[PDB]
Amino acid sequence: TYNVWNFGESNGRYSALTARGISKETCQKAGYWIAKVDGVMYQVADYRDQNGNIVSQKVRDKDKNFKTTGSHKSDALFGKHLWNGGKKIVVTEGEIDMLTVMELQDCKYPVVSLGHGASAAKKTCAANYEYFDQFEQIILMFDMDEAGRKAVEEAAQVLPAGKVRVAVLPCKDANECHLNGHDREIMEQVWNAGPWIPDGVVSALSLRERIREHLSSSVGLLFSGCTGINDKTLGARGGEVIMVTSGSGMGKSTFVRQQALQWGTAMGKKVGLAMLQESVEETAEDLIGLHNRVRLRQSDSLKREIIENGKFDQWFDELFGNDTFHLYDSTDRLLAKLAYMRSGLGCDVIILDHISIVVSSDERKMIDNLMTKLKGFAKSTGVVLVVICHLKNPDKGKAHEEGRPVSITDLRGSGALRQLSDTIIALERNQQGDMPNLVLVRILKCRFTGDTGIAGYMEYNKETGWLEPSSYSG
Amino acid sequence: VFLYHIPCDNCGSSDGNSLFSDGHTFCYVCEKWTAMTYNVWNFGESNGRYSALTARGISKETCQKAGYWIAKVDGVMYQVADYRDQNGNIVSQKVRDKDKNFKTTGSHKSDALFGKHLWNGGKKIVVTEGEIDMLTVMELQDCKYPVVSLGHGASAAKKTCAANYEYFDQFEQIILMFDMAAQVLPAGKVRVAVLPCKDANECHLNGHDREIMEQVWNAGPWIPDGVVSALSLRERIREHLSVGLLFSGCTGINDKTLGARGGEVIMVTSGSGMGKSTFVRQQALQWGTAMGKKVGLAMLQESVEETAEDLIGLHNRVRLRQSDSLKREIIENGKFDQWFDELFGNDTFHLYDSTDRLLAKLAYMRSGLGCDVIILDHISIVVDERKMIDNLMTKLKGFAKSTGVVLVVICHLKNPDKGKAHEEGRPVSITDLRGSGALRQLSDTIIALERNQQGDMPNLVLVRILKCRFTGDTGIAGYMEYNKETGWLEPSSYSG
Amino acid sequence: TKAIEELYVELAARRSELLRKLTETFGSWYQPKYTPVEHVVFNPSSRDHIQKKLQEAGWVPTKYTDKGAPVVDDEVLEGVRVDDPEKQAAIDLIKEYLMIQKRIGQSAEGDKAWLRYVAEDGKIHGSVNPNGAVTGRATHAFPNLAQIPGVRSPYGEQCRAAFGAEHHLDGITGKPWVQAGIDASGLELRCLAHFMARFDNGEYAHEILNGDIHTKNQIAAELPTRDNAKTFIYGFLYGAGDEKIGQIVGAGKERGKELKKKFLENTPAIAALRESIQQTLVESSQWVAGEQQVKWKRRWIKGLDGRKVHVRSPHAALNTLLQSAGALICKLWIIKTEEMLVEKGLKHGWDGDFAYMAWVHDEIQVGCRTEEIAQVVIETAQEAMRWVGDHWNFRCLLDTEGKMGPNWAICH
DNA sequence: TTAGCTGGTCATTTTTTTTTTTTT
RNA sequence: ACCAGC
Ligand SMILES: Cc1cn([C@H]2C[C@H](O)[C@@H](COP(=O)(O)OP(=O)(O)OP(=O)(O)O)O2)c(=O)[nH]c1=O
Ligand SMILES: Cc1cn([C@H]2C[C@H](O)[C@@H](COP(=O)(O)OP(=O)(O)OP(=O)(O)O)O2)c(=O)[nH]c1=O
Ligand SMILES: [Mg+2]
Ligand SMILES: [Mg+2]
Ligand SMILES: [Zn+2]
């Protein structure tokens, strides 16, 4: 903080390093020395300019703390002053690694060290671009940690191409391999290392097994209620966002709940619901009543009857015996809870409902960022994701609930919903027409099969709640 | 550590004194041992005494090993606790008295703990939110097991526990005793146990301290958030099975709506001045004093006294605001309070006097007064006119959710462009709700009123159900005839 | 691990009840630190506060070991009477609190406790020094597996049930194993019959072979328990006084004199052997009123294998002559009992057939896979003990006894 | 003139490009 | 000084 500490006023002395394995000759050559001030022996590193002017000190104590002597520059490199040329340099992460490489090479190769570490390595490598132009090969030598991989990935972007090569180590870094006696395996990594391949691009031939693995995987889940839908959809696979829409109160939640029950009690798939329209008890009673082919909430006398004769447990054990269902209790925390539902529990189908409250500033950027995050969550996971949405107000003509055929550009809020959803299914019925229990399924978008239009017809039952495959001809 | 025995000098025994590797000796016979403010308070200056706490029960040795000492400065009693570092120096202090005067002296860091200056290696650790429970666990475990405590409380656990990561990383299992939730710690390692009392001090002072120690060594898993499995729904559904409020005025409505439930949004609409307030007022008067339910009204069109006069004139089957002599006669003979008492003896009616300030008042009416049916009128003053109404409907749907309240909302209609107007008997559609298009998306029941004031019968109305999630029966419910002499509209039997 | 954590969580909520109930009876007081005083409370762990509280409760100790303080132990807290009948019940709670405190200090909260020396495979490795005592007796440390409380002590069976051999499932079948424990009965008392057989012409070891010696000693000495009789005979044998063996029966020095005169005139060969040993080792002993000046002639004693056994005190020569010759036969027997099993065609180790677990001064504890292996071990132990008795040409007949069980509570 | 041989204990407000869903 | 063993 005060000033550059002179070795005369701080009792400087050049010694060896027994605990790390460095003799006094290397620390004499570099300038890493030891001060005796305030009783406690302080370790201190010296920084120099291109000419040799002392500009900065790095003071560290016995208990792993940091102390800067003043203005720490961005072009501060430990070891830059000693070398002014060469064909092969080695850039070390810390400061003991550079001394270790100087110990194992008898002061031959130009080896330097960083001045910031792995936190601000990109700034000090962008500010030292003019120094690396006079060289021919650069060997990056960082830690075998996740932060070390992040540093060797992101700090190798502001470097000149064709001259960067990355070596690997079995230890944390080179110093423990010097302590464990791996002095022969490090010299081969100095001489022959691996080039700047693993950035993220792949080769055309390295996928040959993995495409086979995906060839041996990815079976679609068959829908229920209609066989004409599966003839142009072929199920639902991993990474499949299926959008469901209709008019206001036309049977979205009923069809989705029936699809969830038919996937639960007949396939054994672990299904995670996130119903936000109603709470847990109402949808639980709806599932229990729908499995027993009755309307549970629509009969107070039946609810009074089934609790007296003790047959409620007979319906509870046949449903929740295997615990295949996992419900949710009512913005970025929902993504983490769905991530825990997928990874921590192990579900295969995730169902949401009523996305308009979730997007409730500018709603378009919010719903676009939300759809991007759900698409990225569905990507590289292998999960069916069912999303329920609503429609907007038409300008002229009749209403959507009165049996009007709906188009694909009627999804409210933005246009980004149809640009990322794979299969969009719309439901159509007329409650004021002749038959208010005959529905129409319309495939608006299908990325995989490509067959759009009217799928089939189903007939709703007002007594049991089980809509059946009808045989109506339009 | 013990090495061997030496002959003592005080007691003069042969094998009574024991020598240690630290250089000190100890005799078993003679019992002789050898060898803001921004100011840290000195121990001997402020009359530091290691007194044992009496009213709750803490031994003297725990206060000596923890650094919780009593100051007698200025004639009062302070309880100073000390927070240290890994080096073994006093970092900060905390002063507590009978009035809980929080005088935190010294450099109080954001990652300050208590009891970390002695413990670096181990297997288990217990983290509490206070200091008395931590010393209580030290009393139960005789000050030999690693127990730390937060220095800032359970309100800022996202800062103190997050800054200390490598200290908690050195152990194998971390047990929490906060409330009877911080996920910054690594997963697969943190256990949370549940005590049958408020904290550990109540189990200590009520003999349930065994249930402390049974939960320490046998704590339960993490269980992060409200992800509820299907097994935990055994008694909640059975409690939920053990009700539709009847719509008074017409019997054709209840045949296809089956009343309203807990958390039910009812929307009432008609044309411009077709009598929404009269119909909703009749339902409120027939539901409040005739069914025993507490109803909260929020009539924003008129004042409190005017709707009180309406209610009083309605219930007595007269027209109060349509005659001055009828208003004058009822006060000159003392029959005014007779209408007051027989209607307001039960206090089931609560009126409102006149946008986020409304939701707090509705929460105070629902939770505090304990009502069941809340009625809102004249939404136009409350509500760009698309984001505000959508946010308002979302907040009211969230308020009606998980509460058990029937929320009635009166809305309006938009102006038509072609054809006949709504005052001449036009059949209204579902997409005529002005303001937004989400009003028919969150409402669970939609009721429309249709009448023609210029046709053959200017007092015949029609009820149209537009949306019903419970059954799915929409359309014309029936016909009712309005009275131009009493105000009470009656169910008729008109045919098309 | 689970069975001892259950015991620890059981008896940790007991001493937290014995302090709330007790400090309200024995109240706090002021102690002198213008005169500085402090409000000190009753500490039941200290032996000084209980002495002060029994002074002011109306009790006279009538026993002064120290020059200014009475003695406080288990035998003075039983025969104590006060006027207040609440303190008479409170003294039993004080003794129970001290017992639970020692249990806690030994079991889990100690620096050398049980739970701080458990390996990753659920086992305990203890240091066993083969020659630690001055009489060739092996010692045990870090931790000490030869000093846990027995089955006669309270909370004794619940501790020895955890130190079992059935907690090691086999790695090929997943089955628990069988523990065999083999103890010698009457070791030093038969070695004494071997030594002094040249004085009484060897008609003393015949009664020892004729039935149990401790049972008929209990009958002829009217002791209540066999353990008190076994304590009394080895107290009388290894140079007692007039009161320390009257303390075993609880009577005065007159009964302690008449029992010595009774057991001395039965077999007049103990005093002759003692006189022979004193004539062999010492030659002169000058007497001091506060010390003793002894001019030695032979400090060491030749043992059974020519080993120079050291003598510390001249009146304890019978002790270092008896127990030093009694450990070597067990040390050879534990060698021979595996030298027969290896030559028989068995395999030692956890992946084999048998494994040695614990060797205290008298008995051995072996763990084996099947019960037939335990039968072979309990058959060959008698043959090994016979080869021990035959190899050094003993005049007596050595005999052991073995037990078979799941753990080390039945096979004690 | 004396039962012994072990182990273990506690202590210090300004301007301009893109999108959407109502209404005058 | 106390506790436990062998
Ligand atoms: C398809 C269909 C549904 N119904 C009833 C049963 C359904 O529970 C009810 C509507 O309930 P939902 O199925 O929940 O309606 P929705 O999901 O399409 O939209 P929202 O919840 O936002 O209003 O309509 C019929 O009466 N006849 C029919 O043909
Ligand atoms: C109890 C005790 C035993 N010993 C000796 C006697 C034995 O030689 C050895 C162990 O004694 P024990 O095994 O207790 O007695 P025991 O072997 O004669 O009889 P049994 O097996 O049938 O129960 O240690 C003492 O020296 N001092 C003592 O206080
Ligand atoms: Mg729905
Ligand atoms: Mg024995
Ligand atoms: Zn002493």
Side-chain angles (χ1 to χ4, degrees), chain A residues 249-254 257 275 277-278 353-354 388 390, chain B residues 441 467 469:
Chain A
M250 292 295 106
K252 293 183 290 293
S253 296
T254 302
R257 187 179 296 114
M275 294 295 172
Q277 293 180 357
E278 293 176 352
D353 194 0
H354 192 79
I388 299 167
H390 289 88
Chain B
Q441 294 179 357
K467 184 177 183 292
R469 188 177 293 172

Side-chain angles (χ1 to χ4, degrees), chain A residues 405-471:
Chain A
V406 63
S407 66
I408 197 167
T409 61
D410 291 330
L411 300 177
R412 67 178 294 165
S414 68
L417 294 175
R418 68 183 185 272
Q419 294 180 357
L420 293 175
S421 297
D422 293 332
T423 300
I424 298 170
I425 299 170
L427 277 75
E428 294 178 356
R429 68 178 179 88
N430 192 0
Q431 65 182 358
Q432 294 180 357
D434 195 1
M435 292 177 70
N437 298 116
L438 184 63
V439 298
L440 190 149
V441 176
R442 188 180 295 275
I443 304 299
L444 289 172
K445 185 179 184 293
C446 183
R447 184 175 291 171
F448 181 71
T449 63
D451 292 331
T452 63
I454 297 170
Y457 292 98
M458 296 182 289
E459 182 68 29
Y460 184 75
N461 205 345
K462 293 292 288 184
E463 293 177 350
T464 62
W466 285 92
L467 50 88
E468 65 183 1
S470 178
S471 66

Side-chain angles (χ1 to χ4, degrees), chain C residues 137 183-188 214 226 230 234 238 323 362:
Chain C
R137 294 176 66 88
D183 192 1
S185 296
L187 190 145
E188 293 181 355
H214 293 285
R226 185 177 181 270
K230 186 173 74 174
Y234 288 104
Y238 293 103
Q323 70 179 359
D362 198 2

Side-chain angles (χ1 to χ4, degrees), chain A residues 102-311:
Chain A
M102 288 182 70
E103 183 68 28
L104 293 173
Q105 290 178 355
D106 292 331
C107 298
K108 193 261 183 181
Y109 292 97
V111 181
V112 298
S113 179
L114 293 175
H116 290 170
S119 66
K122 274 78 70 177
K123 183 175 174 66
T124 188
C125 288
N128 289 318
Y129 183 75
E130 69 272 15
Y131 183 76
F132 290 160
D133 189 74
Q134 65 182 357
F135 290 155
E136 192 267 328
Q137 287 181 356
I138 299 170
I139 305 298
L140 292 178
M141 188 65 72
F142 291 98
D143 293 331
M144 196 65 204
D145 291 330
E146 291 85 4
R149 295 295 92 192
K150 182 259 290 180
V152 75
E153 178 68 29
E154 293 180 354
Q157 305 299 323
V158 298
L159 295 177
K163 295 188 287 184
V164 176
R165 186 175 292 172
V166 177
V168 297
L169 293 175
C171 303
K172 190 261 183 182
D173 54 359
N175 200 357
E176 288 87 6
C177 287
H178 177 72
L179 291 174
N180 292 116
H182 296 285
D183 292 331
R184 293 177 63 88
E185 291 85 4
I186 52 96
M187 295 300 291
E188 293 180 354
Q189 295 293 321
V190 172
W191 290 351
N192 298 115
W196 192 58
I197 298 171
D199 299 331
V201 298
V202 297
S203 178
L205 279 76
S206 65
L207 293 170
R208 185 178 179 179
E209 184 68 29
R210 287 179 286 174
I211 298 173
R212 185 179 295 274
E213 183 178 1
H214 185 75
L215 190 62
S216 65
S217 65
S218 178
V219 177
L221 278 74
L222 272 298
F223 292 97
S224 296
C226 182
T227 187
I229 297 170
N230 295 114
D231 292 331
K232 63 179 72 175
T233 306
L234 274 299
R237 278 82 50 85
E240 185 72 23
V241 177
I242 297 170
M243 188 66 73
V244 175
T245 186
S246 75
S248 180
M250 292 295 106
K252 293 183 290 293
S253 296
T254 302
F255 180 74
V256 170
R257 187 179 296 114
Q258 182 176 0
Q259 282 306 316
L261 184 63
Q262 288 295 108
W263 289 352
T265 192
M267 293 179 183
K269 298 293 183 182
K270 188 178 290 294
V271 178
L273 280 75
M275 294 295 172
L276 295 174
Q277 293 180 357
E278 293 176 352
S279 295
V280 178
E281 293 86 3
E282 291 87 4
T283 183
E285 290 178 354
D286 288 331
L287 288 171
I288 293 169
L290 186 61
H291 186 272
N292 295 112
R293 273 74 174 175
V294 296
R295 295 179 66 88
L296 183 62
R297 292 185 292 112
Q298 287 81 17
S299 295
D300 292 331
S301 66
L302 184 62
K303 292 186 287 184
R304 187 179 66 190
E305 182 179 1
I306 63 170
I307 199 65
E308 294 292 327
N309 53 4
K311 68 186 291 184

Side-chain angles (χ1 to χ4, degrees), chain B residues 458-472:
Chain B
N459 297 115
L460 180 62
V461 299
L462 189 149
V463 175
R464 188 178 294 274
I465 300 299
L466 293 175
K467 184 177 183 292
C468 182
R469 188 177 293 172
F470 190 73
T471 62

Side-chain angles (χ1 to χ4, degrees), chain B residues 8 10-13 27 29-30:
Chain B
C8 183
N10 194 1
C11 64
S13 65
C27 185
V29 176
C30 64

Side-chain angles (χ1 to χ4, degrees), chain A residues 63 248-249 276-282 284-285 288 295-300 303 306-307 312-313 316-317 320 323 325-330 337 340-341 345 354 356-357 359-361 363 390-394 399-402 412 431-432 460 462, chain B residues 87 222-234 236-238 240-241 243-244 258 261-262 386-387 390-391 394 397 401-402 417-418 428-431 433 436-438 440-444 464-475:
Chain A
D63 292 331
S248 180
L276 295 174
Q277 293 180 357
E278 293 176 352
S279 295
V280 178
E281 293 86 3
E282 291 87 4
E285 290 178 354
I288 293 169
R295 295 179 66 88
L296 183 62
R297 292 185 292 112
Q298 287 81 17
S299 295
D300 292 331
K303 292 186 287 184
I306 63 170
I307 199 65
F312 178 74
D313 293 330
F316 184 76
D317 292 331
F320 291 164
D323 290 331
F325 295 97
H326 296 284
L327 297 174
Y328 182 76
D329 194 1
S330 178
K337 291 178 178 66
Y340 181 73
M341 186 179 288
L345 278 75
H354 192 79
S356 66
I357 289 174
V359 299
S360 297
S361 296
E363 290 181 352
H390 289 88
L391 297 173
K392 64 183 180 180
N393 288 321
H400 293 170
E401 291 84 2
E402 294 178 353
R412 67 178 294 165
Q431 65 182 358
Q432 294 180 357
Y460 184 75
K462 293 292 288 184
Chain B
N87 297 114
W222 177 249
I223 310 299
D225 289 329
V227 178
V228 178
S229 179
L231 186 63
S232 178
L233 277 75
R234 179 65 178 270
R236 295 180 68 188
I237 301 170
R238 185 176 293 170
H240 191 273
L241 290 173
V243 177
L258 274 299
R261 279 84 59 195
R386 194 262 301 164
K387 180 67 173 66
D390 197 1
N391 196 2
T394 303
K397 181 66 177 177
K401 183 175 72 68
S402 70
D417 291 331
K418 292 182 183 292
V428 65
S429 66
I430 189 167
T431 61
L433 297 175
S436 68
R440 69 185 185 274
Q441 294 179 357
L442 289 175
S443 296
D444 295 332
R464 188 178 294 274
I465 300 299
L466 293 175
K467 184 177 183 292
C468 182
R469 188 177 293 172
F470 190 73
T471 62
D473 293 331
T474 60

